[PDB]
Amino acid sequence: FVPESDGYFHSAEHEGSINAIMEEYRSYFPKWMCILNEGFNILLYGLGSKHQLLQSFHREVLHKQTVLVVNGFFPSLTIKDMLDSITSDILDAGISPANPHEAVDMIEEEFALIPETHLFLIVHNLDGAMLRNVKAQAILSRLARIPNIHLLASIDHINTPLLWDQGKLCSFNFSWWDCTTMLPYTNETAFENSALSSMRSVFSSLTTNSRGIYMLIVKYQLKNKGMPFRDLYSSCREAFLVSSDLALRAQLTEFLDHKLVKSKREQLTIPIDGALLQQFLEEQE
Amino acid sequence: SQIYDRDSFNFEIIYARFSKFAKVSTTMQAVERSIVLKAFEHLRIAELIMPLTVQKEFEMHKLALTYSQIHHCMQRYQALPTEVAQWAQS
Protein backbone atom coordinates (compact mmCIF):
# COMPACT_ATOMS: atom_id res chain seq x y z
CA PHE A 1 0.00 0.00 0.00
CA VAL A 2 1.73 3.13 -1.30
CA PRO A 3 -0.85 5.95 -1.25
CA GLU A 4 -0.76 8.86 -3.66
CA SER A 5 -0.74 12.42 -2.36
CA ASP A 6 -2.56 13.85 -5.39
CA GLY A 7 -5.90 12.46 -4.22
CA TYR A 8 -5.78 14.69 -1.13
CA PHE A 9 -4.67 17.89 -2.87
CA HIS A 10 -7.23 17.74 -5.71
CA SER A 11 -10.19 17.50 -3.32
CA ALA A 12 -22.30 -21.03 -0.86
CA GLU A 13 -18.66 -20.88 -1.96
CA HIS A 14 -18.07 -18.00 0.48
CA GLU A 15 -18.91 -20.06 3.58
CA GLY A 16 -16.57 -22.87 2.55
CA SER A 17 -13.75 -20.41 1.88
CA ILE A 18 -14.36 -18.73 5.26
CA ASN A 19 -14.28 -22.15 6.96
CA ALA A 20 -10.99 -23.01 5.22
CA ILE A 21 -9.64 -19.61 6.31
CA MET A 22 -10.67 -20.27 9.93
CA GLU A 23 -9.09 -23.74 9.91
CA GLU A 24 -5.86 -22.25 8.51
CA TYR A 25 -5.81 -19.70 11.34
CA ARG A 26 -6.65 -22.49 13.81
CA SER A 27 -3.43 -24.21 12.72
CA TYR A 28 -1.37 -21.26 14.03
CA PHE A 29 -2.06 -21.89 17.73
CA PRO A 30 1.00 -23.99 18.81
CA LYS A 31 3.27 -21.53 17.00
CA TRP A 32 1.44 -18.74 18.84
CA MET A 33 2.14 -20.46 22.17
CA CYS A 34 5.80 -20.86 21.19
CA ILE A 35 5.95 -17.16 20.27
CA LEU A 36 4.23 -16.12 23.52
CA ASN A 37 6.75 -18.26 25.41
CA GLU A 38 9.65 -16.10 24.19
CA GLY A 39 8.18 -12.80 25.41
CA PHE A 40 6.50 -11.63 22.22
CA ASN A 41 2.86 -10.58 22.04
CA ILE A 42 0.40 -11.49 19.31
CA LEU A 43 -1.45 -8.83 17.32
CA LEU A 44 -4.02 -9.52 14.59
CA TYR A 45 -4.90 -6.93 11.95
CA GLY A 46 -7.20 -8.65 9.46
CA LEU A 47 -10.30 -7.32 7.74
CA GLY A 48 -13.24 -9.02 9.43
CA SER A 49 -14.28 -9.83 12.97
CA LYS A 50 -11.59 -11.66 14.94
CA HIS A 51 -13.77 -12.23 18.02
CA GLN A 52 -14.41 -15.91 17.24
CA LEU A 53 -10.73 -16.64 16.55
CA LEU A 54 -9.57 -15.30 19.91
CA GLN A 55 -12.47 -17.07 21.63
CA SER A 56 -11.37 -20.30 19.92
CA PHE A 57 -7.81 -19.68 21.12
CA HIS A 58 -9.01 -19.15 24.70
CA ARG A 59 -11.25 -22.23 24.50
CA GLU A 60 -8.99 -24.75 22.73
CA VAL A 61 -5.59 -23.77 24.20
CA LEU A 62 -5.86 -21.64 27.36
CA HIS A 63 -8.45 -23.76 29.15
CA LYS A 64 -6.42 -24.05 32.38
CA GLN A 65 -4.47 -20.79 32.78
CA THR A 66 -5.56 -17.48 34.29
CA VAL A 67 -7.24 -15.48 31.52
CA LEU A 68 -8.63 -11.93 31.61
CA VAL A 69 -10.73 -11.41 28.50
CA VAL A 70 -11.22 -7.68 27.90
CA ASN A 71 -13.89 -6.58 25.42
CA GLY A 72 -12.48 -3.28 24.22
CA PHE A 73 -15.35 -2.72 21.77
CA PHE A 74 -17.62 -2.31 24.81
CA PRO A 75 -18.70 1.36 24.85
CA SER A 76 -18.71 1.58 28.65
CA LEU A 77 -15.55 -0.08 29.93
CA THR A 78 -12.94 1.88 31.87
CA ILE A 79 -9.27 1.19 32.47
CA LYS A 80 -10.11 1.38 36.19
CA ASP A 81 -12.51 -1.55 35.69
CA MET A 82 -9.79 -3.72 34.12
CA LEU A 83 -7.25 -2.71 36.78
CA ASP A 84 -9.71 -3.43 39.61
CA SER A 85 -10.51 -6.72 37.84
CA ILE A 86 -6.83 -7.76 37.86
CA THR A 87 -6.12 -6.52 41.40
CA SER A 88 -9.28 -7.85 43.09
CA ASP A 89 -10.00 -11.04 41.16
CA ILE A 90 -6.57 -12.41 40.23
CA LEU A 91 -4.42 -11.18 43.11
CA ASP A 92 -7.18 -10.85 45.80
CA ALA A 93 -5.66 -7.49 46.77
CA GLY A 94 -8.83 -5.40 46.98
CA ILE A 95 -9.72 -2.38 44.90
CA SER A 96 -6.84 -0.77 42.99
CA PRO A 97 -5.60 2.78 43.72
CA ALA A 98 -7.38 5.63 41.96
CA ASN A 99 -4.34 6.70 39.94
CA PRO A 100 -3.81 3.98 37.32
CA HIS A 101 -0.01 4.12 37.03
CA GLU A 102 0.33 3.46 40.77
CA ALA A 103 -2.04 0.52 40.23
CA VAL A 104 0.24 -0.81 37.48
CA ASP A 105 3.19 -0.26 39.86
CA MET A 106 1.47 -2.41 42.49
CA ILE A 107 0.53 -5.03 39.88
CA GLU A 108 4.19 -5.22 38.81
CA GLU A 109 5.45 -5.53 42.40
CA GLU A 110 2.86 -8.23 43.16
CA PHE A 111 3.42 -10.24 39.95
CA ALA A 112 7.17 -10.06 40.58
CA LEU A 113 6.54 -12.09 43.75
CA ILE A 114 4.78 -14.95 41.94
CA PRO A 115 6.63 -16.50 38.98
CA GLU A 116 5.06 -19.45 37.10
CA THR A 117 1.64 -17.81 37.48
CA HIS A 118 0.96 -16.46 34.01
CA LEU A 119 -1.92 -14.08 33.32
CA PHE A 120 -3.15 -14.22 29.74
CA LEU A 121 -4.73 -11.00 28.55
CA ILE A 122 -7.02 -11.13 25.52
CA VAL A 123 -8.08 -7.63 24.46
CA HIS A 124 -10.60 -7.73 21.64
CA ASN A 125 -10.31 -4.41 19.75
CA LEU A 126 -7.23 -2.83 21.36
CA ASP A 127 -8.33 0.36 19.54
CA GLY A 128 -11.79 0.17 21.13
CA ALA A 129 -14.07 3.10 21.87
CA MET A 130 -12.75 3.78 25.39
CA LEU A 131 -9.15 2.63 24.81
CA ARG A 132 -8.41 5.23 22.12
CA ASN A 133 -6.62 7.69 24.41
CA VAL A 134 -2.89 7.82 25.11
CA LYS A 135 -3.34 6.96 28.80
CA ALA A 136 -5.05 3.57 28.38
CA GLN A 137 -2.48 2.50 25.81
CA ALA A 138 0.30 3.55 28.18
CA ILE A 139 -1.35 1.42 30.89
CA LEU A 140 -1.70 -1.57 28.55
CA SER A 141 1.90 -1.21 27.35
CA ARG A 142 3.11 -1.12 30.96
CA LEU A 143 0.99 -4.21 31.64
CA ALA A 144 2.29 -6.15 28.62
CA ARG A 145 5.90 -5.35 29.58
CA ILE A 146 5.51 -7.66 32.63
CA PRO A 147 7.07 -11.08 31.88
CA ASN A 148 4.25 -12.95 33.64
CA ILE A 149 1.49 -11.25 31.63
CA HIS A 150 1.07 -12.44 28.05
CA LEU A 151 -1.08 -10.39 25.70
CA LEU A 152 -3.16 -11.10 22.60
CA ALA A 153 -4.99 -8.31 20.84
CA SER A 154 -6.94 -7.34 17.74
CA ILE A 155 -6.94 -4.05 15.85
CA ASP A 156 -9.46 -2.90 13.25
CA HIS A 157 -9.19 0.88 12.92
CA ILE A 158 -6.74 2.09 10.28
CA ASN A 159 -5.42 4.96 12.44
CA THR A 160 -4.44 2.64 15.30
CA PRO A 161 -0.61 3.22 15.41
CA LEU A 162 -1.04 6.99 15.71
CA LEU A 163 -1.37 6.58 19.48
CA TRP A 164 1.63 4.22 19.80
CA ASP A 165 4.99 5.96 19.95
CA GLN A 166 8.30 4.10 19.97
CA GLY A 167 8.24 3.51 23.73
CA LYS A 168 4.76 2.00 23.71
CA LEU A 169 5.77 -0.08 20.69
CA CYS A 170 8.88 -1.22 22.56
CA SER A 171 6.80 -2.26 25.56
CA PHE A 172 4.23 -3.90 23.26
CA ASN A 173 6.64 -6.54 21.96
CA PHE A 174 4.28 -7.31 19.11
CA SER A 175 4.37 -10.18 16.64
CA TRP A 176 2.10 -9.03 13.83
CA TRP A 177 -0.17 -11.60 12.21
CA ASP A 178 -2.49 -11.21 9.21
CA CYS A 179 -5.52 -13.10 10.49
CA THR A 180 -7.89 -11.88 7.78
CA THR A 181 -11.25 -13.50 8.21
CA MET A 182 -14.18 -12.25 6.15
CA LEU A 183 -16.69 -12.45 8.99
CA PRO A 184 -18.94 -9.41 9.49
CA TYR A 185 -18.73 -7.28 12.64
CA THR A 186 -21.87 -8.58 14.33
CA ASN A 187 -20.88 -8.06 17.97
CA GLU A 188 -18.66 -5.00 17.52
CA THR A 189 -21.27 -2.76 15.87
CA ALA A 190 -24.18 -3.96 18.02
CA PHE A 191 -23.60 -1.49 20.87
CA GLU A 192 -24.60 2.14 21.31
CA ASN A 193 -21.31 3.57 19.99
CA SER A 194 -22.30 2.66 16.41
CA ALA A 195 -39.62 10.62 12.32
CA LEU A 196 -43.29 10.41 11.40
CA SER A 197 -44.16 7.10 13.08
CA SER A 198 -42.47 7.95 16.39
CA MET A 199 -44.25 11.31 16.32
CA ARG A 200 -47.61 9.56 15.85
CA SER A 201 -46.79 6.97 18.54
CA VAL A 202 -45.91 9.60 21.15
CA PHE A 203 -48.81 11.79 19.93
CA SER A 204 -51.31 9.03 20.71
CA SER A 205 -50.05 9.03 24.32
CA LEU A 206 -50.71 12.75 24.93
CA THR A 207 -53.90 14.11 26.46
CA THR A 208 -56.40 16.44 24.77
CA ASN A 209 -54.89 19.83 25.67
CA SER A 210 -51.38 18.60 24.82
CA ARG A 211 -52.71 17.56 21.41
CA GLY A 212 -54.29 21.00 21.05
CA ILE A 213 -51.03 22.80 21.87
CA TYR A 214 -49.21 20.64 19.31
CA MET A 215 -51.92 21.31 16.70
CA LEU A 216 -51.48 25.05 17.29
CA ILE A 217 -47.73 24.63 16.65
CA VAL A 218 -48.46 22.53 13.52
CA LYS A 219 -50.98 25.06 12.16
CA TYR A 220 -48.57 27.96 12.70
CA GLN A 221 -45.67 26.09 11.07
CA LEU A 222 -47.87 25.07 8.13
CA LYS A 223 -49.15 28.62 7.63
CA ASN A 224 -45.71 30.22 7.77
CA LYS A 225 -43.88 27.33 5.99
CA GLY A 226 -40.21 28.48 14.43
CA MET A 227 -43.01 30.29 16.21
CA PRO A 228 -42.46 32.73 19.10
CA PHE A 229 -43.48 31.82 22.64
CA ARG A 230 -45.83 34.80 22.94
CA ASP A 231 -47.98 33.88 19.93
CA LEU A 232 -48.24 30.29 21.18
CA TYR A 233 -49.17 31.52 24.67
CA SER A 234 -51.79 33.88 23.22
CA SER A 235 -53.32 31.13 21.07
CA CYS A 236 -53.32 28.74 24.04
CA ARG A 237 -54.99 31.30 26.33
CA GLU A 238 -57.54 32.10 23.61
CA ALA A 239 -58.77 28.50 23.23
CA PHE A 240 -58.41 27.89 27.03
CA LEU A 241 -55.82 25.17 26.36
CA VAL A 242 -53.57 26.20 29.28
CA SER A 243 -54.11 27.84 32.66
CA SER A 244 -50.98 30.02 32.97
CA ASP A 245 -47.48 30.41 31.55
CA LEU A 246 -45.68 27.79 33.67
CA ALA A 247 -47.92 24.89 32.63
CA LEU A 248 -47.23 25.77 28.99
CA ARG A 249 -43.49 25.94 29.73
CA ALA A 250 -43.58 22.50 31.37
CA GLN A 251 -45.64 21.13 28.46
CA LEU A 252 -43.17 22.48 25.90
CA THR A 253 -40.32 21.01 27.99
CA GLU A 254 -42.12 17.65 27.77
CA PHE A 255 -42.33 18.25 24.01
CA LEU A 256 -38.54 18.78 23.91
CA ASP A 257 -38.06 15.57 25.90
CA HIS A 258 -39.93 13.35 23.40
CA LYS A 259 -38.28 15.03 20.34
CA LEU A 260 -41.30 16.82 18.86
CA VAL A 261 -40.41 20.50 19.32
CA LYS A 262 -36.89 21.96 19.13
CA SER A 263 -36.29 25.12 21.14
CA LYS A 264 -34.13 27.97 19.84
CA ARG A 265 -33.31 31.43 21.19
CA GLU A 266 -38.68 31.60 22.10
CA GLN A 267 -38.48 29.90 18.70
CA LEU A 268 -40.25 26.51 18.67
CA THR A 269 -39.63 24.67 15.40
CA ILE A 270 -40.76 21.17 14.45
CA PRO A 271 -37.91 19.24 12.72
CA ILE A 272 -40.29 17.83 10.07
CA ASP A 273 -40.72 19.05 6.48
CA GLY A 274 -43.90 20.79 5.39
CA ALA A 275 -45.53 18.13 3.20
CA LEU A 276 -45.40 15.55 6.00
CA LEU A 277 -46.85 18.16 8.38
CA GLN A 278 -49.66 18.72 5.86
CA GLN A 279 -50.38 14.98 5.65
CA PHE A 280 -50.20 14.81 9.46
CA LEU A 281 -52.71 17.67 9.79
CA GLU A 282 -55.00 15.86 7.34
CA GLU A 283 -54.57 12.78 9.56
CA GLN A 284 -55.98 14.69 12.55
CA GLU A 285 -59.09 15.93 10.68
CA SER B 1 2.29 50.15 20.97
CA GLN B 2 2.38 53.79 19.84
CA ILE B 3 2.44 52.80 16.17
CA TYR B 4 -0.26 50.11 16.21
CA ASP B 5 -2.47 51.73 18.93
CA ARG B 6 -1.88 49.27 21.81
CA ASP B 7 -2.06 46.17 19.65
CA SER B 8 -0.66 42.93 21.03
CA PHE B 9 3.00 42.18 20.42
CA ASN B 10 5.27 39.14 20.23
CA PHE B 11 8.89 38.21 20.77
CA GLU B 12 9.51 38.09 17.02
CA ILE B 13 7.98 41.52 16.37
CA ILE B 14 9.90 43.21 19.19
CA TYR B 15 13.11 41.38 18.26
CA ALA B 16 12.71 42.63 14.67
CA ARG B 17 12.13 46.20 15.88
CA PHE B 18 15.12 45.86 18.23
CA SER B 19 17.44 44.36 15.61
CA LYS B 20 16.62 47.26 13.30
CA PHE B 21 18.17 49.47 16.01
CA ALA B 22 21.01 47.19 17.13
CA LYS B 23 22.69 46.89 13.72
CA VAL B 24 23.27 50.67 13.56
CA SER B 25 23.62 51.29 17.31
CA THR B 26 27.41 50.60 17.62
CA THR B 27 26.84 49.61 21.26
CA MET B 28 24.47 46.65 20.72
CA GLN B 29 25.99 44.92 17.68
CA ALA B 30 27.21 41.71 19.36
CA VAL B 31 24.05 40.61 21.22
CA GLU B 32 22.84 37.06 20.59
CA ARG B 33 19.21 36.07 20.13
CA SER B 34 19.25 33.97 23.32
CA ILE B 35 20.34 36.90 25.51
CA VAL B 36 17.50 39.07 24.20
CA LEU B 37 15.11 36.15 24.79
CA LYS B 38 16.28 35.86 28.41
CA ALA B 39 15.82 39.62 28.80
CA PHE B 40 12.29 39.21 27.41
CA GLU B 41 11.66 36.48 29.99
CA HIS B 42 12.96 38.84 32.68
CA LEU B 43 10.44 41.44 31.53
CA ARG B 44 7.70 38.79 31.50
CA ILE B 45 8.29 37.42 35.01
CA ALA B 46 8.58 40.91 36.54
CA GLU B 47 5.06 41.63 35.16
CA LEU B 48 6.07 44.55 32.97
CA ILE B 49 4.64 42.28 30.25
CA MET B 50 1.47 40.29 30.74
CA PRO B 51 0.10 37.45 28.59
CA LEU B 52 -3.32 37.59 26.95
CA THR B 53 -4.89 35.31 29.56
CA VAL B 54 1.72 28.51 21.57
CA GLN B 55 5.53 28.54 21.68
CA LYS B 56 7.58 30.67 24.07
CA GLU B 57 8.86 32.90 21.24
CA PHE B 58 5.38 33.35 19.72
CA GLU B 59 3.01 34.15 22.61
CA MET B 60 1.03 37.36 22.28
CA HIS B 61 1.44 39.86 25.09
CA LYS B 62 0.34 43.18 26.58
CA LEU B 63 2.32 46.10 27.97
CA ALA B 64 1.49 46.66 31.64
CA LEU B 65 2.98 50.18 31.69
CA THR B 66 1.68 53.54 30.63
CA TYR B 67 3.80 55.69 28.34
CA SER B 68 4.33 58.27 31.10
CA GLN B 69 6.05 55.70 33.33
CA ILE B 70 8.47 54.77 30.54
CA HIS B 71 9.06 58.46 29.82
CA HIS B 72 9.90 59.11 33.48
CA CYS B 73 12.15 56.04 33.52
CA MET B 74 14.10 57.54 30.60
CA GLN B 75 14.72 60.65 32.72
CA ARG B 76 15.53 58.88 36.00
CA TYR B 77 17.86 56.24 34.54
CA GLN B 78 21.51 56.44 35.56
CA ALA B 79 24.30 56.29 32.94
CA LEU B 80 21.94 55.70 30.04
CA PRO B 81 23.96 55.91 26.79
CA THR B 82 22.97 58.66 24.38
CA GLU B 83 22.21 56.23 21.53
CA VAL B 84 19.34 54.66 23.48
CA ALA B 85 18.23 58.09 24.72
CA GLN B 86 18.04 59.34 21.13
CA TRP B 87 16.21 56.23 19.94
CA ALA B 88 13.70 56.75 22.77
CA GLN B 89 12.59 60.16 21.47
CA SER B 90 11.76 58.88 17.97
Binding site: F1, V2, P3, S5, D6, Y8, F9, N159, Q166 | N10
Partner: protein, 114 residues
Protein backbone atom coordinates in the same frame (compact mmCIF):
# COMPACT_ATOMS: atom_id res chain seq x y z
CA UNK C 1 23.44 17.85 16.95
CA UNK C 2 20.08 16.06 16.80
CA UNK C 3 20.64 12.70 15.14
CA UNK C 4 17.43 11.19 13.79
CA UNK C 5 16.27 8.29 11.62
CA UNK C 6 15.91 8.92 7.90
CA UNK C 7 12.12 8.92 7.60
CA UNK C 8 12.01 10.87 10.86
CA UNK C 9 14.06 13.56 9.09
CA UNK C 10 11.70 13.55 6.09
CA UNK C 11 8.67 13.65 8.41
CA UNK C 12 10.11 16.56 10.37
CA UNK C 13 10.87 18.65 7.29
CA UNK C 14 7.44 17.70 5.91
CA UNK C 15 5.94 19.00 9.15
CA UNK C 16 7.94 22.22 8.78
CA UNK C 17 6.66 22.68 5.22
CA UNK C 18 3.14 21.93 6.47
CA UNK C 19 3.39 24.51 9.25
CA UNK C 20 5.11 27.21 7.16
CA UNK C 21 3.93 27.05 3.54
CA UNK C 22 0.35 28.38 3.48
CA UNK C 23 -1.94 25.34 2.89
CA UNK C 24 -3.66 26.88 -0.16
CA UNK C 25 -0.23 26.87 -1.88
CA UNK C 26 0.11 23.06 -1.57
CA UNK C 27 -1.83 22.59 -4.82
CA UNK C 28 0.83 24.55 -6.71
CA UNK C 29 3.88 23.12 -4.93
CA UNK C 30 3.15 19.41 -4.52
CA UNK C 31 0.82 17.93 -7.18
CA UNK C 32 3.69 17.77 -9.76
CA UNK C 33 2.98 35.74 12.87
CA UNK C 34 2.98 32.08 13.89
CA UNK C 35 3.57 28.57 12.56
CA UNK C 36 0.37 27.28 10.98
CA UNK C 37 -1.62 24.31 12.20
CA UNK C 38 -1.81 21.15 10.11
CA UNK C 39 -3.53 17.78 10.22
CA UNK C 40 -1.81 14.40 10.04
CA UNK C 41 -3.34 13.76 6.60
CA UNK C 42 -1.76 16.94 5.18
CA UNK C 43 1.55 16.01 6.83
CA UNK C 44 1.50 12.54 5.25
CA UNK C 45 0.52 14.06 1.89
CA UNK C 46 3.50 16.44 2.00
CA UNK C 47 5.66 13.50 3.15
CA UNK C 48 4.64 11.44 0.12
CA UNK C 49 5.09 14.49 -2.10
CA UNK C 50 8.68 15.17 -0.98
CA UNK C 51 9.86 11.59 -0.42
CA UNK C 52 10.11 10.55 -4.13
CA UNK C 53 10.61 6.91 -3.09
CA UNK C 54 7.07 5.80 -2.04
CA UNK C 55 7.60 3.72 1.09
CA UNK C 56 4.47 1.90 2.26
CA UNK C 57 2.39 2.97 5.25
CA UNK C 58 3.33 0.70 8.13
CA UNK C 59 3.29 0.88 11.91
CA UNK C 60 6.70 2.53 12.13
CA UNK C 61 5.87 5.69 10.16
CA UNK C 62 2.91 6.75 12.31
CA UNK C 63 4.88 5.55 15.34
CA UNK C 64 7.57 8.00 14.22
CA UNK C 65 4.92 10.73 14.11
CA UNK C 66 3.90 9.90 17.70
CA UNK C 67 7.48 9.76 18.97
CA UNK C 68 8.34 13.06 17.29
CA UNK C 69 5.37 14.42 19.22
CA UNK C 70 6.76 12.90 22.43
CA UNK C 71 10.21 14.43 21.77
CA UNK C 72 8.55 17.90 21.61
CA UNK C 73 9.57 18.46 18.00
CA UNK C 74 5.85 18.58 17.16
CA UNK C 75 3.00 19.57 19.46
CA UNK C 76 -0.77 19.27 19.79
CA UNK C 77 -2.38 22.71 19.55
CA UNK C 78 -5.92 21.28 19.28
CA UNK C 79 -7.74 17.97 19.51
CA UNK C 80 -5.55 15.39 21.35
CA UNK C 81 -8.59 13.39 22.50
CA UNK C 82 -9.51 12.48 18.89
CA UNK C 83 -6.10 11.83 17.31
CA UNK C 84 -7.48 8.91 15.27
CA UNK C 85 -10.66 10.56 13.97
CA UNK C 86 -9.00 13.23 11.80
CA UNK C 87 -9.90 16.30 13.88
CA UNK C 88 -6.53 16.62 15.65
CA UNK C 89 -4.32 19.57 14.68
CA UNK C 90 -0.53 19.67 15.02
CA UNK C 91 2.11 22.37 14.63
CA UNK C 92 5.86 22.23 14.07
CA UNK C 93 8.10 23.67 16.81
CA UNK C 94 11.54 24.17 15.21
CA UNK C 95 13.33 26.82 13.19
CA UNK C 96 14.62 27.05 9.64
CA UNK C 97 18.32 26.50 10.44
CA UNK C 98 17.69 23.01 11.84
CA UNK C 99 15.59 22.17 8.76
CA UNK C 100 18.42 23.32 6.48
CA UNK C 101 20.93 21.24 8.47
CA UNK C 102 18.65 18.22 8.04
CA UNK C 103 18.39 18.99 4.31
CA UNK C 104 22.18 19.14 4.13
CA UNK C 105 22.62 15.80 5.90
CA UNK C 106 19.90 14.17 3.76
CA UNK C 107 20.54 15.53 0.27
CA UNK C 108 17.08 17.10 -0.16
CA UNK C 109 17.02 20.86 -0.63
CA UNK C 110 14.28 22.65 1.31
CA UNK C 111 14.72 26.18 -0.10
CA UNK C 112 13.42 25.04 -3.50
CA UNK C 113 10.21 23.93 -1.75
CA UNK C 114 10.10 26.94 0.60
Amino acid sequence: SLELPYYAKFLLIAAFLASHNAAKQDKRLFVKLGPKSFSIDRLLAIFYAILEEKVGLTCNLLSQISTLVHLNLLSFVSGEQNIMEGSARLQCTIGLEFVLQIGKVVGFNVRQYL
